[PDB]
Design a protein around this ligand. Structure first.
Ligand SMILES: OC[C@H]1O[C@@H](O)[C@H](O)[C@@H](O)[C@H]1O
Length: 322
């Protein structure tokens, strides 16, 4: 019986969102002096669960996992594996509607998320304002089955209903990848040309991919684009006028807090069974970012006040399901 191992599972190191997510976990392990293990699936749900199992075995269950499930289906099997191993796990973003932490006390510590319908409608509303409320819009979505992809898209469709002057030219999935969004933006410009008066992206990486295509056609900054994540590269694009808005989930914080909750549960520092539901399944507070407050968000992400000890400081409310 040695030290507890802290592990963080996520899709890829190529998306700055996860670069920070990983940084935060790394920083939390650092603070408590526990070994850290990053796990990257690279899009393979099969690899992600395989790795988690391999780790659960080498630690004899003495593990605290903070994972962002590749797909919502993966969440249940991961949670089942941790539960039988006696390990503790926290979920981020993706999970089935029926999967609740309170059904797996105390191993399934918590699920963290944000209201994608609200924020998606927020970035979409800002985008349409920029367009004068009229014009053609193309939209890039995340992995089809992902909960945030579904919610943010739902937020978009709602902003559209409130702006009948906006015409949705075409919605396409780019799986959160800028390299997949690039060629899609190109084909849209060839297909719709001047009809495109704006671009909505389900996350920053895809927006930057969209902006790379615009830049290649000398339109970067002339066609308003929005994203979500609030990643440093996304923030830079906002200060430069190329991205009109984004939403900061604070991946750094997400990465560390997830493990913090899990570790405190394992140490019996918190009484899981007695926590309100909104502390088990939480929608967290995020920061809408635009040029007016971009400088403040940038400064935050270079001098992060790692509030690991204050577990429920950002609980906006419980996760809701339409
Ligand atoms: O797994 C869900 C996450 O996937 C990331 O690629 C994306 O940047 C996040 O905003 C969230 O959608």
């Amino acid at each position: 019986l040695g030290q507890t191992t802290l592990a963080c599972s996520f899709r890829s190191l190529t998306n700055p969102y996860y670069t920070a997510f990983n940084k935060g976990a790394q920083s939390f392990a650092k603070s408590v002096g526990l070994p850290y293990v990053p796990l990257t699936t690279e899009g393979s749900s099969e690899k992600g669960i395989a790795d988690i199992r391999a780790l659960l075995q080498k630690t004899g269950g003495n593990l605290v996992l903070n994972v962002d499930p590749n797909d919502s289906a993966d969440a249940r099997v991961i949670v089942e594996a941790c539960s039988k191993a006696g390990a503790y796990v926290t979920t981020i973003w993706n999970k089935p509607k029926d999967l609740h932490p309170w059904d797996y006390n105390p191993n399934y510590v918590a699920h963290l998320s944000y209201d994608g319908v609200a924020y998606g409608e927020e970035t979409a509303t800002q985008l349409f304002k920029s367009m004068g409320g009229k014009g053609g819009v193309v939209a890039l979505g995340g992995i089809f089955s992902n909960v945030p992809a579904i919610e943010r898209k739902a937020g978009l469709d709602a902003a559209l209903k409130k702006f009948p002057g906006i015409q949705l030219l075409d919605f396409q999935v780019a799986d959160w990848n800028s390299q997949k969004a690039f060629p899609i933006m190109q084909a849209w410009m060839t297909r719709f040309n001047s009809k495109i008066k704006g671009v909505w992206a389900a996350n920053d990486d895809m927006a930057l991919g969209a902006i790379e295509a615009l830049r290649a056609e000398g339109l970067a900054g002339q066609i308003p684009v929005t994203g979500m994540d609030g990643t440093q590269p996304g923030l830079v694009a906002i200060k430069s006028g190329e991205l009109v808005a984004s939403v900061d989930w604070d991946p750094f914080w997400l990465g560390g807090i997830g493990l913090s909750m899990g570790l405190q549960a394992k140490e019996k520092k918190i009484d899981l069974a007695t926590l309100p539901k909104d502390r088990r399944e939480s929608f967290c507070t995020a920061t809408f970012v635009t040029k007016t407050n971009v400088q403040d968000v940038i400064a935050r992400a270079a001098s992060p006040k790692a509030e690991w000890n204050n577990l429920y400081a950002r609980v906006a409310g419980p996760v809701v399901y339409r």
